[PDB]
RNA sequence: CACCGGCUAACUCCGUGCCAGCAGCCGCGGUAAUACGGAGGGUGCAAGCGUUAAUCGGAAUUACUGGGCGUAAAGCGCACGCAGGCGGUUUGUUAAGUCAGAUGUGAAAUCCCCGGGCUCAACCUGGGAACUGCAUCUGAUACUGGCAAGCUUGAGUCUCGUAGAGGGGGGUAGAAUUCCAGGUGUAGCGGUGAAAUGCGUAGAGAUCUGGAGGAAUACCGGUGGCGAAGGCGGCCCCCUGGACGAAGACUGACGCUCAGGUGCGAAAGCGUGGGGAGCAAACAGGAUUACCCUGGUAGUCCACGCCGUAAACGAUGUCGACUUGGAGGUUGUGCCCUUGAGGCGUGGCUUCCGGAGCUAACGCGUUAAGUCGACCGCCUGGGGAGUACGGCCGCAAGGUUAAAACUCAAAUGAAU
């Protein structure tokens, strides 16, 4: 089937400037493709570690004119392997970026948030519908599970908007660039992250009713009153910190 | 419901002329009879007749010259939603004098020229061209 | 529509909006140049048009156009502006009067001199 | 002094080459430019000529004179109804509106007409007309209003019937899916383009017998019917609203429309409590290069409250009157002879063609988008925007009322 690469030159100047790749940082840009996003990397990085799932691209990618011998190429799926392995190889957290099919762009950051320190900052370009939810806050309609989980790990900052007519066979949606960089310290640490996911999933699965029965499958009114959580407000009104409060309580108690 | 019978009479005349009818009928009243008499004297209709005792009905006979209706355009001026009165030296003229205007003065129903002759004003009922 | 409806609520005229608000119903105004630069026109036109940013005595601050070929404007020049917009230059609605205050007339003009502040060739 | 591409009176040469520049709008300028800069010639005004600002006109573009709302902007989702606007026909009375005459006033100047004075003109000045208005007296009585008495054709009441998925409540029946328990029986079933997750030797799937429970009513069924609209479908009973027809009797204008107000209002969604067979947002898995397959929660169901929105559409407000025809459907009734689906009539609702007329066209066409009257709602270039701020309403989601700055020279409808 057909993918839709970025052609307009005016747009891809902000992206390059925003990343500002210097010398001495590990860049792991997945899916070079036609190198449309690495060719404007001509300030170069004396090296880069590239990952490509296709051997045909890897084969007809080892020479180019000038590329040749600066980068090491891996031919395994990024979703499968251990990024942190290539963390003591250099000795610093890796700086990465990509333009992946929005379709596969969701599972990677949740496969990358686990490895933590081996990662310092990220700059991906995602859909506008999704970017707004990531930087969203309580009491809106863009507030959801994705916002809570992502905000628990790192900081989300939009970087650049791409109007639809920048790509060849341009789609019906708008794309965007956000900057995320993991927190140095957790404002609200949770013993078991999976329990936090369990609570948020259950609460937002009945997003439109009060938590007295939306979340009453596990809790009770007087318990939630104990922690100072109003039992008559919808799941979209609960702040991230509060969502970490019962995350701690459900492990502290039974 | 029915809130203006004079306009109803005028519409009956107009629609009958447009459809080449020979005569029209309608429920009668004094005002309608006076208007019919003024129309007949100016040669716009042939004749009018009233018959009936408890429910009189007025019957008008229309008039054509040669494959043409003689009543070119008949129009109601002062209606229940807006009434029009004119002083003696403001009475209008229709087709610059070729037509008539029906005026109701203190001495009866007449044409604009007759009212001007008698030096009266009144309420304008209709324009007939 | 109906007479009764009009009696309850009359016809209302739309209000006209002026095209030159910074003039405030004055034929001209005096201002001080803050920046002198060059800008490009909109599509199907190609040039390097000369404009300036001016601060007026009434506190407004606008962009104005400098017609003719050649000028001597810099920072802290005192000029006089008038109305009139430039079509293929979005955001420009005023012209600069050549030959008044610190703006000089165009050199070597011979036709339509009075629109550019050129004295009659003593020749 | 301005101008000479069109609007708009007046044309050629040289220079430059999407530069320099011009421009009120449409636009001109990349090598012969009547559009940029100079020159020759010409056009219009003239002691002035151009530019800028501001008001009216053109603009019927807020339409009283004088516009619109099926598809271009524009009929509230639907009904009831207070204030308000309007109101059939006859007689009498009154004289408020209305009309006629007169009197008082409406400063002078100014505007208009006929004259007079500066050598003319501008300017100055005599007399008149006008100042459309208001008040007070005296009359007129056709029309509207008030008051009194009538009338029956508008509107209602009574008597007998007809058709109908109109509404609320309670019973009950037969097919099918799932589950349970029994029989016969041995190894696959299901699904896909092909497979896999999945079910099965603790006997599945298949075929027969018994039960449990929930949701919906095949055929009839129609382009058919009922309802203000949303909508309404097995059978039986109880309570109940409207429409229509026949003959006769009765009341006597008791009417139409309706801003604020009150009520009803698909689906999704919410609160308290039940129920849960099938399906199925979210979710959990399996694949292929979207869409697919296997499980499955909220929900769909019931009682009682909330929400108040839809391409809630005939994109067509309610009431009344008038204007040539032809094919169908459904539901009453009068008269003759009578095997009557036999002939002659007379009502209600509904579908499709098409005449005059209307319309930009498409099209509408007695169920009007034709010819008229009464009242109400709404519109004013496109985007920003049905958005922001404020008020009211809501448990929440949100509903309702509702701008401006800025930006463009178009956006749009029907037909070829």
Structural class of chain B: alpha+beta
Strand and helix order of chain A:
HEHEHEHEHHEEHHHH
The Cα radius of gyration of chain B reads 15 Å
* Anisotropy-based shape of chain A: elongated
* Amount of helix of chain B: 25-40%
Query: Approximately what portion of the residues of chain B adopt beta-strand conformation?
Result: 25-35%
GO molecular function (chain C): rRNA binding; structural constituent of ribosome; tRNA binding
Subunit structure (chain C): Part of the 30S ribosomal subunit. Contacts proteins S8 and S17. May interact with IF1 in the 30S initiation complex.
Keywords (chain C): Ribonucleoprotein, Ribosomal protein, RNA-binding, rRNA-binding, tRNA-binding
Protein name (chain C): Small ribosomal subunit protein uS12
Give a summary of the structure in a few sentences.
With 129 residues, chain B is α+β, with helices and mostly antiparallel strands. Chain B contains three helices and eight strands; from the N terminus they run H-E-H-E-E-E-E-E-E-H-E.
């Amino acid at each position: 089937f057909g993918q839709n690469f970025l052609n307009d030159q005016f747009v891809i100047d902000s992206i390059v400037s925003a990343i500002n790749p210097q010398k001495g940082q590990a860049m792991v840009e997945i899916g070079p493709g036609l190198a449309a996003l690495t060719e404007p990397v001509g300030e170069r990085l004396d090296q880069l570690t590239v990952i490509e799932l296709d051997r045909d691209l890897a084969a007809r990618l080892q020479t180019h004119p000038f590329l040749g011998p600066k980068l090491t190429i891996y031919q395994q799926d990024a979703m499968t392997f251990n990024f942190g392995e290539l963390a003591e190889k250099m000795g610093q957290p890796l700086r990465v970026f990509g333009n992946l099919p929005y379709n596969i762009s969701t599972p990677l950051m949740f496969h990358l948030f686990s490895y933590t320190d081996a990662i310092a900052d990220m700059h991906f370009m995602l859909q506008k519908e999704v970017v707004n939810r990531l930087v969203a806050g309580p009491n809106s309609k863009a507030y959801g599970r994705l916002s809570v989980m992502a905000q628990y790990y790192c900081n989300v900052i939009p970087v650049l908007e791409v109007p639809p007519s920048a790509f060849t066979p341009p789609p019906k949606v708008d794309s965007a660039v956000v900057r995320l960089v993991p927190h140095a310290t957790m404002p609200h640490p949770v013993k078991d992250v999976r329990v936090l996911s369990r609570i948020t999933t259950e609460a937002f699965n009945q997003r439109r009713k009060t938590i007295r029965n939306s979340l009453g499958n596990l809790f009770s009114v007087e318990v939630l009153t104990g922690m100072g959580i109003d039992p008559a407000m919808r799941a979209e009104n609960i702040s991230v910190a509060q969502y970490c409060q019962m995350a701690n309580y459900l492990a502290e108690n039974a | 419901s029915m809130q203006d019978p004079i306009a109803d009479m005028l519409t009956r005349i107009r629609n009958g002329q447009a459809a080449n009818k020979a005569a029209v009928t309608m429920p009668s009243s004094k005002l309608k009879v006076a208007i019919a008499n003024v129309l007949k004297e100016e040669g716009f209709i042939e004749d009018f007749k009233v018959e009936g005792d408890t429910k009189p009905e007025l019957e008008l006979t229309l008039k054509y010259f040669q494959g043409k209706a003689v009543v070119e355009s008949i129009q109601r001026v002062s209606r229940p939603g807006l009434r029009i009165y004119k002083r003696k030296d403001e009475l209008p003229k229709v087709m610059a004098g070729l037509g008539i205007a029906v005026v109701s003065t203190s001495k009866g129903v007449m044409t604009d020229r007759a009212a001007r002759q008698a030096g009266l004003g009144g309420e304008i009922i209709c324009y007939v061209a | 529509a109906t007479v009764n409806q009009l009696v309850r609520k009359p016809r209302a005229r739309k209000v006209a909006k002026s095209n030159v608000p910074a003039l405030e119903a004055c034929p001209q105004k005096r201002g001080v140049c803050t920046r002198v630069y060059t800008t490009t026109p909109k599509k199907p036109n190609s040039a390097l048009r000369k404009v300036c940013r001016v601060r007026l005595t009434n506190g407004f601050e606008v962009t104005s156009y400098i017609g003719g070929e050649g000028h001597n404007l810099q920072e802290h020049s005192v000029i006089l502006i008038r109305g009139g917009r430039v079509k293929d230059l979005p955001g420009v609605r005023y012209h600069t009067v050549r030959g008044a205050l610190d703006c000089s007339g165009v050199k070597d003009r011979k036709q339509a001199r009075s629109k550019y502040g050129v004295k009659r060739p003593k020749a």
